[PDB]
Amino acid sequence: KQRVFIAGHRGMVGSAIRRQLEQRGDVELVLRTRDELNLLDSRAVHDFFASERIDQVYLAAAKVGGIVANNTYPADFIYQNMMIESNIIHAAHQNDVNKLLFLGSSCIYPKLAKQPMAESELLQGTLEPTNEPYAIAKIAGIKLCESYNRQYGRDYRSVMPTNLYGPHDNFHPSNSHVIPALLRRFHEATAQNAPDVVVWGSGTPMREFLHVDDMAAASIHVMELAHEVWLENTQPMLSHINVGTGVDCTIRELAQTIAKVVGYKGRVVFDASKPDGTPRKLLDVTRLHQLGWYHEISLEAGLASTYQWFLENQDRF
Amino acid sequence: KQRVFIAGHRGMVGSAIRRQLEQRGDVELVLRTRDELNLLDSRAVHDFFASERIDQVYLAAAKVGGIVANNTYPADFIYQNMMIESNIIHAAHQNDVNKLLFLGSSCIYPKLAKQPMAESELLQGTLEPTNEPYAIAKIAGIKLCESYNRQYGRDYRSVMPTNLYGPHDNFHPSNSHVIPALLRRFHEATAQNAPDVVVWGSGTPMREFLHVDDMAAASIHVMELAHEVWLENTQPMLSHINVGTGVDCTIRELAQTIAKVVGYKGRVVFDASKPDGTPRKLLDVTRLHQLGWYHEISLEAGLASTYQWFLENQDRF
């Protein structure tokens, strides 16, 4: 019986992975809360790996946030993510944990990358200023994995998800991510019977979204693949795997779909006097598809279930 | 009286900085050996900064090595450099040390960068595979500095040196750096009266070299510049300063000059059946020159004094 440690099991991705592994008896979960185990503490992390008998590690713990948070606390974002990555990855190796899955982010890609973005786009150009500190920490996480694989013959894999959404997301008013921000605004506009909802921009830019449960499924899939199969579809120094739908849709289509899901009858208005971001941004998921994994949750379906979750948990935001 | 901590004062660059600061009484040096203070230990480093009263920090400690070492121990190179950087930079901030100088490397630049390489070439393309792990750690070091400067209003500066040489370099046979490797080979070839010395390649590629004492001088200069002057010549997210001569010379000229300095009378032969590296590689030192610093040690002069040092210390290699 495989003993699995999911670091950061209370976060959005961590909890999604936990939900799916809990639904099988060939796995026994070892979980620690931030209060029980301080991930920034090297000694604490090493002590934990020495005391427990871990077979696999899902490194889902991270200091994440929106546009405001990343620009307001840059030092906390780079430092904490670097320490969490280093502590877990090194302690794991020191205690013979051969399997590990590192969950990265989509922010690691160059601001002006070629679309769709293949894995080889990594480090090909300058990063988005807003995400620079966080992105550098994530890239260092991937390179730590590759370096331990090369030097010690470890099996430390990594996956880079596109924009995620789903239950346990940050629905607070402070969150800048488009899906939870719009679900919240359309909900209140519907409740207050507001004539319209104005969204900044033209609505033309294209984005890719993946439900967190599909993310968890792909993660576990990649983690459980045969080592020879994984090696065959990656390179030692270009080992990460993009996880997404490969399907893009305009912000206009997204907003309009959220309005429908929530039952909003007012008007959705795009203020084109405000600037748009990059025109298009999506991942090339060829590598993932060749590994035999395809997403199941469609946008409309994922937004409907996510909204349902928000309804039963709104007294938390 | 300024209390200065030079991390890694026994290394090549650390010791060069120490030699120059020791020659002035307006500075009091706080030094710890690797045995006295384990830089990889967070608690130890924080305890040190809490107990001592540091005003400035020269972060010259690093896990460095040649071509063989970087490809053989990639995990040790990325992990150790990341921990040393994170520990010192964070402990410094936690204990109110407002001034810090981070010594990077030239390896951080893209393999196919535009020549000469300006600071803005950082993160513009893929890294040299051999140096990838070490380079990622160094870049993370620069971004930590920038992030603490942005978030906490710190004054954490950084300098990226070109190829260095001088006393306390690694003259062991295992070292791949061209200057110490060639000084050693020409010395023995001269002693053994060998008819010739064969060097791989055509001798046409161009490289830049800086004596470690000039490096130390530039470092202290940049560290001591007025904050307003430094801010005026850098950007918050592009804050590093290239340190070098801006002068390049062929490997052929370098080899030929070393032969002369050592008194070798045989023939220097370049085997063109072996591949060369990139044709040219040197730093754009415009930013440094505008800050009013210019190197003093010329190549011939620097090699002669470095050889002299090697002679008086050969019973160590």
Swiss-Prot record, chains A, B:
Location of the active site: Y134 (proton donor/acceptor)
pH-activity profile: Optimum pH is 6-6.5.
Primary location: cytoplasm
Signal peptide: none
Keywords for this protein: Cytoplasm, Isomerase, Multifunctional enzyme, NADP, Oxidoreductase
Recorded metabolic or biological pathway in which this protein acts: Nucleotide-sugar biosynthesis; GDP-L-fucose biosynthesis via de novo pathway; GDP-L-fucose from GDP-alpha-D-mannose: step 2/2; Exopolysaccharide biosynthesis; colanic acid biosynthesis
Site residues, Lowers pKa of active site Tyr: K138
Regulation affecting activity: Subject to product inhibition by NADP and GDP-fucose.
Entry keyword annotation includes Oxidoreductase: yes
SUPFAM superfamilies listed in its UniProt record: NAD(P)-binding Rossmann-fold domains
Keyword Cell division found: no
Catalytic activity: GDP-beta-L-fucose + NADP(+) = GDP-4-dehydro-alpha-D-rhamnose + NADPH + H(+)
Top-level EC class as recorded in UniProt: oxidoreductase
GO annotation (BP), single: 'de novo' GDP-L-fucose biosynthetic process
UniProt-listed Enzyme Commission number(s): 1.1.1.271
GO cellular component term, pick one: cytoplasm
Location within or outside the cell: Cytoplasm
Annotated NADP(+) binding sites: 8-14, 34-39, 103-106, 138, 161-164, 177
Site description Important for catalytic activity, residues in chain: S105, C107
Binding site for substrate: R185, W200, R207, D276
GO molecular function: GDP-L-fucose synthase activity; isomerase activity; NADP+ binding; protein homodimerization activity
Assembly information from the UniProt record: Homodimer.
Function description: Catalyzes the two-step NADP-dependent conversion of GDP-4-dehydro-6-deoxy-D-mannose to GDP-fucose, involving an epimerase and a reductase reaction.
Family, as annotated: Belongs to the NAD(P)-dependent epimerase/dehydratase family. Fucose synthase subfamily.
Full protein name: GDP-L-fucose synthase
Top-level taxonomy: Bacteria, Pseudomonadati, Pseudomonadota, Gammaproteobacteria, Enterobacterales
Primary gene name: fcl
